[PDB]
Amino acid sequence: AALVVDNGSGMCKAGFAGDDAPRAVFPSIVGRPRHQGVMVGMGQKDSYVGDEAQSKRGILTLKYPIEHGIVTNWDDMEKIWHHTFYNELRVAPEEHPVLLTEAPLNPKANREKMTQIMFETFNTPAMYVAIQAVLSLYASGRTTGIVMDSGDGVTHTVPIYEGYALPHAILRLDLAGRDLTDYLMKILTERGYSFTTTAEREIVRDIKEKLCYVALDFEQEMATAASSSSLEKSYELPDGQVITIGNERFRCPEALFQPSFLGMESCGIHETTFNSIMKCDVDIRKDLYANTVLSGGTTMYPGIADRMQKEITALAPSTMKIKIIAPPERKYSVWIGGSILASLSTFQQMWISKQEYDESGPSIVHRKCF
C-alpha cells in the first residue's frame, strides 16, 4: 500500500501504487474569484481547485502554482495536495507513504520545501522524490535508452544506459506546452480571434490538444496552407461561436523544433536530444539512438515521432539506425513508471522515513534523491 502523486505543471496525476492507470487526473490550478465589494451568493468556496475550477472558469482567475517545474506559490500547492489526498483519492496521508515527482536540474529549495510540507503538514510516514525521466523508462520495460520527456512546464533529456544515468549529459529546456499555448494565442490574435484572460487561455489549450499536428516539412506545409483550404479545420468554443484556425494549426507545434519563433535563442527539442547523446560516452551512443523514448503530453502531437526521426537522422551519422519509442499511453508515462517502482520490494528500502527526516533534517532528501 503506497501513493504515487505526479506534480506536473499542467496536470497532477495521482493514484495508488500497483494500479494500471492513475485514479484521479485533474488540471493543477487554483481558482480565486474576481470578487467586487458586492455580497456573494450561497454555496461559495473561498478558493476552488482542479475539475471544480475547470467547471467555474468564467469568473475565477486561473493561477498555475508550478511555473517551469518550480513551485512559485507553496500555499497554492498545499491546497492542491489537500484536494489530491482527502477529496480526489479519498485516503489519509498519515496511513500511506507518498512518492512525488520533480523535473531534473530544478532549484534545490524546490525538493527541500516539497518534502518539508509532506513530513510536517500532511505527516506522511515516508517520502521519496524521483526524476520524471527515470520513471518514464519503466513504462516501456526498457532499462537502456534516452527519453525526451516534454511536459507542460518543462522538457528534459535524461540518458540512462543499463540502469545507470549520466547526470552531466542531462539538458533542460524551458520551452514547453504552456509556452506553445501562449504562442498559439498570439498567432490566433493575428488571424482575428482574440484570447486574453486566464479562462480564455484554458480554451486555447483545448483547441491546441485537438487540432494542432506536427508537419514533416514546415516550408512545404506553409505552401499547401496558402494555396488550398484543406488544412483549415473548424472548432466550436464553449460559446456557440465557431472559429477556423487555418495554417496556425501546424505553426504552433513548429515552435518545439525551432524556438526562434517563440524567440528564446535556444536549440530545438530535436537538436537538444542529439546534443545530450553527443555529451554521453562514444560507445553507449548506439543504444541511445536505437532507444529514444518520447514521454509527457507534449509528445502526443499527431506525427511528432515522424518529424523527430527525420531531424535526428539528419544530425546523426548515416550508418546509425534511429528508432523513436512512442507508446499509446505517453500522457500517463511518468505515473505508470512510479506505480511499477513503488510496487517493487527493492524500493521498500529506498524510502526516506520520518525518523530519518527528524534527526538529519530536510537536507537528507539531496543525498537520497537519485
Binding site: 467586487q36 493575428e190 488571424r191 482574440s194
Partner: protein, 370 residues
C-alpha cells in the same frame, strides 16, 4: 509622386490628419459617425443621415453617436470609409486623395485582416499613389528625438507598452491590454449613476468623456482620499444644469492602475510598463527604465506621472533610476512622429506603390511594414 504625403493617425477616440510639412496636425476631429436619434421619415429634420466631426459637435444632442473603431480594431468598415472620405472633404485638408501619398498608424499586435482591409480601401476606393502602415509606438520616439525608449501609449481604445533600444524593437516584449480611456469613460458613467446622475444615451456618453477629460485626478494614495471628505466640485453641462461629481472623480481613472476592482482580468498600466521591461534582456533593463516615454491622451490625467513613478518604483528593482519623460504634446505626439518620418527621404523607399500591390499580392503591405 513628389507632392507632400498626408499623415493620418487611426486613433479610436480622435483621428488626427494633416500634411507632413506642418509641425502640428491642422485638422483633428472626433472619430465617430453621427446619425439622427429619431428615425427620420419627415422633412425639416437633419438631412443626409451623416454628421462627422465639427458638424456632429454642433447638433450633438439630436444625433446618435456610433464609434466605428473599438479596441484598435475596425468593426464597421462602411462607417470608417465615410470618416476617411471626410478627411478628404472641403471641411478638412480640401485635396484629392489620388494625388498625395498616405501614412497610417495602426496599434501594435492588431489582426492582419484589419491591416489588409485598411490597405484595400485606401488603394481601391481612394486611388492613393502609395500607402505605409506603421506602429504607433515607433513614431512617438521620432517626435521626442531619441532612438532608445519604452513607449507606454495609452490611447482611447487600447493601451500598449513597446520597448525599443537603439532603433531595435523586441517584438516578444510588446504588451497590449484593452483597458484604455474608453473603458475609464464607461466605468465613470457607472460611478456617476452611483452618485445618482444617469447618462443612458449614446450622446450623453460623450459628455461623460468631457466630464472625465475636465475633472478626474489620480490620487497618490487612493485609500486616504476615500476616508477624507470630498469638496464635491460642480461641473456645468451643455444644457446649463450643475452636477456634483464628488468621490467618483478620483476612483474612476484608478481602474487603469487596478482593473481587478470593477472585475476586468488585466495586468494594469503600471504592470504592463514594468513587465515589458522585465520581459526584455537583463543588460537593457536599466537603460529602458532610464528612458520611458508617455504617449496618447489617457496619460494626461492630473497626477498620472506622479502615481506611475510610485507604482513602478515598488515593482521595479531597488536603487534603479526611473525617468518617465512625458512631452508637452502627448495627445499629438504619435502624429508629429509620422510627420517627421514622412518628411525623410528614407520614407520614399519604405512605402508600397499602387502598381506594387497589384503585382506582388496581399503580403506586400505586411512584409514592408517593418
Amino acid at each position: 509622386i513628389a507632392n507632400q504625403p498626408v499623415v493620418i493617425d487611426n486613433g479610436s477616440g480622435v483621428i488626427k490628419a494633416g500634411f507632413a510639412g506642418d509641425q502640428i496636425p491642422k485638422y483633428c476631429f472626433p472619430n465617430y459617425v453621427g446619425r439622427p436619434k429619431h428615425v427620420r421619415v419627415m422633412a425639416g429634420a437633419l438631412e443626409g443621415d451623416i454628421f462627422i466631426g465639427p458638424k456632429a459637435e454642433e447638433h450633438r444632442g439630436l444625433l446618435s453617436i456610433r464609434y466605428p473603431m473599438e479596441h484598435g480594431i475596425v468593426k464597421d468598415w462602411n462607417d470608417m470609409e465615410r470618416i476617411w472620405q471626410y478627411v478628404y472633404s472641403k471641411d478638412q485638408l480640401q485635396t484629392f486623395s489620388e494625388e498625395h501619398p498616405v501614412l497610417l498608424t495602426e496599434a501594435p499586435l492588431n489582426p492582419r485582416k484589419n491591416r489588409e482591409r485598411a490597405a484595400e480601401v485606401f488603394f481601391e476606393t481612394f486611388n492613393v499613389p502609395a500607402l505605409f502602415i506603421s506602429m504607433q509606438a515607433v513614431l512617438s520616439l521620432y517626435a521626442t528625438g531619441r532612438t532608445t525608449g519604452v513607449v507606454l501609449d495609452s490611447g482611447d481604445g487600447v493601451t500598449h507598452a513597446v520597448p525599443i533600444y537603439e532603433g531595435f524593437a523586441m517584438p516578444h516584449s510588446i504588451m497590449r491590454i484593452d483597458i484604455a480611456g474608453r473603458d475609464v469613460s464607461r466605468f465613470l458613467r457607472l460611478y456617476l449613476r452611483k452618485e445618482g446622475y444617469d447618462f443612458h444615451s449614446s450622446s450623453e456618453f460623450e459628455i461623460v468623456k468631457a466630464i472625465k477629460e475636465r475633472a478626474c485626478y489620480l490620487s497618490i494614495n487612493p485609500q486616504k482620499d476615500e476616508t477624507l471628505e470630498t469638496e464635491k466640485a460642480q461641473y456645468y453641462l451643455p444644457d446649463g444644469s450643475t452636477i456634483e461629481i464628488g468621490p467618483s472623480r478620483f476612483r474612476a481613472p484608478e481602474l487603469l492602475f487596478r482593473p481587478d476592482l470593477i472585475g476586468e482580468e488585466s495586468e494594469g498600466i503600471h504592470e504592463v510598463l514594468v513587465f515589458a521591461i522585465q520581459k526584455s534582456d537583463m543588460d537593457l533593463r536599466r537603460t529602458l527604465f532610464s528612458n520611458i516615454v508617455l504617449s496618447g491622451g489617457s496619460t494626461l490625467f492630473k497626477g498620472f506621472g506622479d502615481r506611475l513613478l510610485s507604482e513602478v518604483k515598488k515593482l521595479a528593482p531597488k536603487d534603479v533610476k526611473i525617468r518617465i519623460s512625458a512631452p508637452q504634446e502627448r495627445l499629438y505626439s504619435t502624429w508629429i512622429g509620422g510627420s517627421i518620418l514622412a518628411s525623410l527621404d528614407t520614407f520614399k523607399k519604405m512605402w508600397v506603390s499602387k502598381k506594387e500591390y497589384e503585382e506582388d499580392g496581399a503580403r506586400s503591405i505586411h512584409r514592408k511594414t517593418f
